[PDB]
RNA sequence: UUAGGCGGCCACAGCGGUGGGGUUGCCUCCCGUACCCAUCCCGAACACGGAAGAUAAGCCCACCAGCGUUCCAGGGAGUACUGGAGUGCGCGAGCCUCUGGGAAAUCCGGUUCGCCGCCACC
RNA sequence: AGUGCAAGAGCAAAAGAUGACUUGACAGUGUUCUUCCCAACGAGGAACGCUGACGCGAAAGCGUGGUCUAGCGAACCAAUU
RNA sequence: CCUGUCAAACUCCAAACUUACAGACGCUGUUUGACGCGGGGAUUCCGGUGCGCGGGGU
């Protein structure tokens, strides 16, 4: 299904699992990437991907964009490179679908999405000064798989 | 003491807003009233803010307006110095205008209609879709700004 | 204590001095409470009324100020308790108080107890208090006959400080006689 | 200071947790006073469907009855270090429990203005062993 | 509403804040009010008896006598005058 | 209030802690079961009777802020949100200006280890 | 925790537990709110009174069923007091 | 300990705002009699749109 059906925040917050059943599992494989044993403060450079518009990103896009991002980091910095990326958002919003015309229209559960306000950090990678151009590229690939336009903003990095 | 002037019509105006304007003795566009600056009166003009033009006028401007647009509680009668002298507690328009600004009395209290029925602004106003800070003619005004409007609506 | 959600009892409940549930049923009468309280050595009786910032004691009496009328005996017994109530009841009559309900606090409604003795004393002083005669001790025990007969099993004096050998419930009679007398500086 | 701080025997509870009686007879003879039945709550698969029903019995001994029992009860036991409660109590065994405490315990057992005994006035395992050991027997 | 009972949608108004939990002080349950006195209506969650219809919480009526120990308070629902039977426990003096 | 009784508000009063206080006074712990009363067993408690002892508990007094709570200053924040207005911007979801209001988390420094009423009483 | 049963709410020297006693789950008649916000409308419901008769308690007092909000039915006719 | 997120049927917090009553000002009424009461006559019980806030539905 198209994201056009679930990208906007036009419905109430629907997360209460004690009242919702049959919610599909999350396709998001990982939230902690790179070296999850090392700390974020142990890195000179901290780059984050910032969403420019308030939206809802389905776990399908979340996985795909996170995948196309980290896969690049693995390709350029190796499977054990000195970096660590983070997906700080979790798909809490349960999505329906009315799949009988408009009669008894309350739809059945089809998936989950993460609500992100404009200006928020969806991703945040921590790397060294050298690998800074690879993380920017991974994020460039990442924002190509999510509904909104994004900014690749450097939080810690006067090395330019 | 502030001078209120309705610049926006009644149609589509909220009833509670329209009712306030009527409580402030103003029932038509371009009608003006002199309101004391009290807590009670302040709440009222704040509610009317978007459909009105207000501010404290200069003694001079107030005198010009009173002379030209003030009226008795009943009748055509011109409110000139002689009129003021014979019916009010003052000696002339200036004496009246001073007490009004100093909030010592009211138009009604002196046998005058609470409303100053002004003429449309000569040369036109700054627009009723924007406030003063945005180049419009709505809301609170500078003493110089209010004078420009009132004098323009001589 | 633990957190924001924590509920701390009312002060007089933490202190375990006021049974609020009983207090309500008590106040429902509208009449003043005849607060009957005890101590290891003494016995007190207050006539309390309700007030805007707290209770109002209109007339009280303590076993300590009992000796002020000729009492050379101890102060934690039946004759003592009764007389204290009678004294309090009399001071109450003086203040305009005409009726009351027995408030015994955290004490037990045991038949023939001192709190009931206090009650009988106040009632005798002329106060109208809802009571039950067969829950009050028998007249003689109020006089302190149970203690005289205890001293009968002598061999060793019951009383340390010499008040007397075989004790005197007759003293009770003497004091009651004194209080019921119209004169007396209350 | 030491007087209103030296321990004493609060109570000695001799109990027999059977599970279904005839046992009351022996306790009455060994202790001296009358015993009391013991009920239970919650249904158990070990044939305990009847909630309120006799399962055991107990006897709370106080004063002489307590000591006169301990004189001929303690020798029958081999007191250990771990067998002591944090509040300065100990249970050995037919269970025989001894509740030990300082001179002003009534403060927490009375109705009027009751209060909980402060940690400092609460008896210690060590202070308990000592008091007991200092009366016809050995510790550890 | 899904149901039309008296306690419908009264989850908030008929519930104590955690610290106001437990039995309420007797003082206010015994308070005496005179006829003509203005009184604020507000049910005390902790007090079961002598309540009025929840819909009336927030009203400020006028004591006009009593029935037994409870009071008869006159209020104006919208435009309709009504007499409410209520105990002191759920009443407070205005001002 | 050189230690009491009944309370109001019901944590600013909680939790935890430190120091000080009692010859015929007070409150206690305390001593003790002939009685009134009492324990489904225990004068433990309740009840009654009483002072050899004690200030160690409690209690009263003075004090500490680590936790919890109340309030205050500054920071966050006139931010978030918002009642009124707009031929203001945006494809749009939405945003902005003007006008009237205005948080919360949190940081920091203070406050708070109850206040008050009636009665009794070296 | 428990409090018969949805859900939400109430309750700790209790509204819960245990024990004992008891039949107020009583007769008669009302006030008020609800049903039906505002604003007319029945049955039903509840809160709060009074009269009579009672139970328990030392007593204040509590009991007009179950802590509160569901568990209900007109005229005609029959049976019943 | 640290570190990453949420709630129409969560809340240690908490608006704007809505709302009861009262006072004040304003406006209004005492020949235009208000507020209120009683009676006669209706029509009406297919609505729609904008804006704000929504709930369902791509
Ligand atoms: Cl007492
Ligand atoms: Cl009602
Ligand atoms: Mg005219
Ligand atoms: Mg022109
Ligand atoms: Mg123009
Ligand atoms: Mg709600
Ligand atoms: Mg000390
Ligand atoms: Mg547009
Ligand atoms: Mg038929
Ligand atoms: Mg039949
Ligand atoms: Na169908
Ligand atoms: Na309460
Ligand atoms: Na039994
Ligand atoms: Na001490
Ligand atoms: Na009815
Ligand atoms: Sr929608
Ligand atoms: Sr069809
Ligand atoms: Sr994009
Ligand atoms: Sr003893
Ligand atoms: Sr367009
Ligand atoms: Sr302000
Ligand atoms: Sr009930
Ligand atoms: Sr509303």
State the CATH number of the domain containing residue D64.
Answer: 3.30.1440.10
On whether the CB atoms of residues B110 and B87 are closer than 8 A, the answer is: yes
CA distance B59 to B96: 10
Q: Which of B11, B55, B15, B36 is nearest to B103 (CA)?
A: B36
At least 3 CB pairs under 8 A between chains D and C: yes
User: Which helix (H) or strand (E) element contains residue C22?
Assistant: helix C20-27
CB-based contact C15 D114, cutoff 8 Å:
no
Residue D3 touches chain C, beta carbons under 8 Å? no
Alpha helices in E1-95 (DSSP H): 27-30
Contacts of A120 (CB under 8 A, 6+ apart): A50, A51, A89
Look at chain D and report how many structural domains it folds into: 1
In the numeric block, the tokens 């009751």 are attached to D114
DSSP C146-161: HHHHHHHS-SS-S-SS
CA closest to C1 among chain E residues: E19
Could you tell me the residue range of the domain that residue D60 belongs to?
1-140
> Can you point out the beta strands (E) in chain C?
33-38, 43-49, 56-62, 101-103
For residue C136, the 8-state DSSP code is: S
CA distance B82 to B88: 10
**What is the number of other CB atoms lying within 10 angstroms of the CB of residue A66?**
27
The segment(s) of chain B belonging to CATH 1.10.15.30 are 58-113
Could you tell me the residue range of the domain that residue A16 belongs to?
1-160
On whether the CB atoms of residues D55 and D41 are closer than 8 A, the answer is: no
Q: Which of E61, E68, E92, A111 is nearest to E84 (CA)?
A: E61
On whether the CB atoms of residues C80 and C87 are closer than 8 A, the answer is: no
CA distance D11 to C150: 30
The closest ligand to the CA of E48 turns out to be 22
Tell me the angle at which helices B93-101 and B59-69 cross, rounded to the nearest 10 degrees.
Answer: 120
Residue D114 touches chain C, beta carbons under 8 Å? yes
DSSP D44-60: BTTTB--SSS--EEEEE
CA distance D91 to D113: 31
Instruction: Return the closest nucleotide (C1') to the Cα of C27.
Output: G60
Q: Which of chain C's residues have a Cβ under 8 Å away from the Cβ of E88?
A: none
Look at chain E and report how many structural domains it folds into: 1
CA distance A88 to B3: 57
For residue A99, the 8-state DSSP code is: -
**What is the number of other CB atoms lying within 10 angstroms of the CB of residue B102?**
10
**Centroid of ligand 1 to alpha carbon of D112 (angstroms):** 7
**Centroid of ligand 22 to alpha carbon of E49 (angstroms):** 8
**Beta C33-38 vs C101-103: how paired, if at all?**
parallel
On whether the CB atoms of residues A55 and A133 are closer than 8 A, the answer is: no
Rg (CA), chain C: 18
Strand order in the sheet with C33-38: C56-62, C43-49, C33-38, C101-103
> How many residues are listed for chain B in this entry?
154
Instruction: Give me the CATH number covering residue E50.
Output: 2.30.30.70
**Centroid of ligand 14 to alpha carbon of C42 (angstroms):** 21
How many Cβ contacts (< 8 angstroms) between chains C and E?
Answer: 25
CA distances, B27 to each of B31, B72, D134 (Å): 7, 17, 104
When CB atoms are compared, the residue of E18, E26, E69 closest to C20 is E26
CA distance A117 to A56: 9
CA distance B84 to B107: 11
Alpha helices in D13-124 (DSSP H): 24-31, 64-70, 106-109
Q: Which of C155, C175, C174 is nearest to C165 (CA)?
A: C155
In the numeric block, the tokens 């003096």 are attached to E93
On whether the CB atoms of residues B117 and B31 are closer than 8 A, the answer is: yes
Name the fold adopted by C1-186.
Nucleotidyltransferase; domain 5 (3.30.420)
On whether the CB atoms of residues A51 and A150 are closer than 8 A, the answer is: yes
**Beta B31-35 vs A84-87: how paired, if at all?**
unpaired
On whether the CB atoms of residues C118 and C75 are closer than 8 A, the answer is: no
Class of CATH domain B58-113: mainly alpha
Assigned token pair, B73:
């509680």
CA distance B57 to B5: 12
Domain boundaries, chain C: 1-186
CA distance A91 to A63: 11
Q: Which residues pair with A154 in a beta bridge?
A: A47
**Beta A108-116 vs A55-58: how paired, if at all?**
antiparallel
The segment(s) of chain B belonging to CATH 3.30.1390.20 are 1-57+114-154
Instruction: Give me the CATH number covering residue A50.
Output: 3.90.1170.10
Q: Which of A133, A123, A122, A125 is nearest to A36 (CA)?
A: A125
On whether the CB atoms of residues D53 and D39 are closer than 8 A, the answer is: yes
CA distance C111 to C129: 17
For residue E1, the 8-state DSSP code is: -
CA distance A152 to A44: 16
Assigned token pair, B85:
């002298």
Query: Which of C12, C15, C16, C39 should we substitute to test contact with D (largest number of D Cβ atoms within 10 Å)?
Result: C16
Look at chain A and report how many structural domains it folds into: 1
CA distance C97 to C89: 9
CA distance D48 to D18: 12
On whether the CB atoms of residues B58 and B34 are closer than 8 A, the answer is: no
**What is the number of other CB atoms lying within 10 angstroms of the CB of residue D130?**
14
CA distance B20 to C118: 71
CA closest to C5 among chain E residues: E18
In the numeric block, the tokens 């004194």 are attached to C178
User: Which helix (H) or strand (E) element contains residue A71?
Assistant: helix A59-77
Question: To what resolution in angstroms was this structure determined?
Answer: 2.8
Name the fold adopted by B1-57+114-154.
Ribosomal Protein L30; Chain: A, (3.30.1390)
| Minimum-distance residue to G18 (CA–C1') | D52
Q: Which residues pair with A51 in a beta bridge?
A: A150
Could you tell me the residue range of the domain that residue E66 belongs to?
1-95
CA distance A72 to B16: 63
At least 3 CB pairs under 8 A between chains E and A: no
**Beta A108-116 vs A121-127: how paired, if at all?**
unpaired
Contacts of C119 (CB under 8 A, 6+ apart): C34, C36, C85, C102, C129, C131, C136
């Amino acid at each position: 299904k198209p994201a056009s059906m679930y990208r906007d925040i036009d419905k109430p917050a629907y997360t209460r699992r004690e009242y919702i059943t049959g919610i599909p599992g999350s396709k998001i494989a990982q939230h902690k990437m790179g070296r999850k044993q090392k700390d974020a403060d142990d890195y000179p450079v901290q780059i984050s991907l910032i969403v420019e518009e308030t939206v809802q990103l389905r776990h399908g896009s979340l996985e795909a964009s996170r995948l196309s991002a980290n896969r690049h980091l693995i390709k350029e910095l190796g499977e054990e490179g000195d970096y660590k990326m983070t997906l700080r958002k979790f798909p809490h919003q349960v999505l329906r679908e009315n799949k009988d015309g408009m009669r008894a229209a309350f739809g059945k559960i089809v998936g989950t999405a993460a609500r992100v306000q404009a200006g928020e950090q969806l991703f945040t990678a921590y790397c060294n000064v050298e690998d800074a151009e690879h993380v920017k590229e991974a994020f460039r690939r990442a924002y190509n798989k999510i509904t909104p336009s994004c900014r690749i903003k450097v939080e810690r990095g006067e090395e330019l | 003491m502030h001078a209120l002037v309705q610049l926006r019509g009644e149609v589509n105006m909220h009833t509670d807003i329209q009712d306030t304007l009527e409580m402030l003795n103003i029932h038509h566009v371009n009608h003006c009233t002199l309101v004391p600056e009290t807590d009670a009166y302040r709440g009222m003009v704040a509610k009317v803010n978007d459909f009105v033009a207000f501010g404290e006028p200069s003694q001079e401007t107030l005198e010009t307006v009173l002379a030209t647009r003030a009226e008795p509680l009943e009748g055509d009668a011109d409110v000139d110095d002689e009129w003021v002298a014979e019916h009010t507690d003052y000696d002339d328009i200036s004496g009246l205008a001073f007490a009004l600004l100093s909030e010592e009395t009211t138009l009604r209290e002196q046998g005058l209609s609470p409303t100053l029925r002004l003429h449309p602004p000569r040369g036109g106003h700054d627009g009723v879709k924007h406030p003063v800070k945005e180049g419009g003619q709505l809301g609170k005004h500078d003493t110089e700004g209010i004078d420009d409007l009132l004098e323009a609506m001589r | 204590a633990t957190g924001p959600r924590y509920k701390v009892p009312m002060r007089r409940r933490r202190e375990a001095r006021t049974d609020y549930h009983q207090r309500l049923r008590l106040l429902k009468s509208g009449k003043p409470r005849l607060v009957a309280r005890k101590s290891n050595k003494h016995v007190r009786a207050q006539l309390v009324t309700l007030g805007p910032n707290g209770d109002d004691t209109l007339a009280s009496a303590h076993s300590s100020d009992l000796a002020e009328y000729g009492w050379e005996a101890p102060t934690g017994n039946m004759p003592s308790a009764y007389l204290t109530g009678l004294l309090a009841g009399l001071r109450a009559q003086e203040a305009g108080v005409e009726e009351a309900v027995l408030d015994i606090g955290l004490n037990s409604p045991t038949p023939g107890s001192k709190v009931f003795a206090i009650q009988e004393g106040a009632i005798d002083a002329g106060l109208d208090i809802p009571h039950n005669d067969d829950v009050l001790a028998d007249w003689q025990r109020t006089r302190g006959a149970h203690i005289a007969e205890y001293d009968e099993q002598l061999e060793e004096p019951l009383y340390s400080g010499d008040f007397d050998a075989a004790d005197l419930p007759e003293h009770f009679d003497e004091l009651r006689e004194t209080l019921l007398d119209g004169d007396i500086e209350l | 200071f030491h007087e209103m701080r030296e321990p004493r025997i609060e109570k000695v509870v001799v109990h027999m947790g059977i599970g279904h009686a005839n046992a009351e007879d022996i306790l009455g003879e060994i202790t001296g006073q009358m015993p009391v039945r013991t009920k239970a709550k919650r249904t158990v698969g070990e044939f305990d469907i009847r909630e309120g029903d006799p399962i055991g019995a107990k006897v709370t001994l106080r004063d002489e009855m307590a000591e006169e029992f301990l004189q001929t009860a303690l020798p029958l036991a081999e007191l250990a270090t771990s067998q002591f409660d944090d509040t300065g109590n100990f249970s050995f065994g037919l269970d025989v429990t001894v509740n030990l405490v300082r001179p002003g315990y009534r403060v927490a057992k009375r109705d009027k203005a009751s209060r909980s005994i402060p940690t400092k006035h609460r008896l210690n395992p060590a202070d308990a062993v000592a008091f007991i050991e200092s009366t016809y027997d050995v510790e550890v | 509403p899904s149901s039309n009972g008296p306690l419908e949608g009264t989850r908030g108004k008929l519930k104590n804040k955690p610290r106001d939990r437990g039995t309420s002080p007797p003082q206010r349950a015994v308070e005496e009010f005179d006829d003509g006195e203005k009184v604020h209506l507000k049910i005390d969650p902790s007090v079961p008896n002598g309540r009025f219809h929840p819909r009336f919480d927030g009203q400020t009526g006028t004591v006009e006598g009593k029935q037994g120990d409870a009071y008869k308070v006159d209020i104006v629902d919208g435009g309709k005058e009504k007499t409410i039977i209520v105990t002191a426990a759920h009443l407070r003096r205005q001002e």
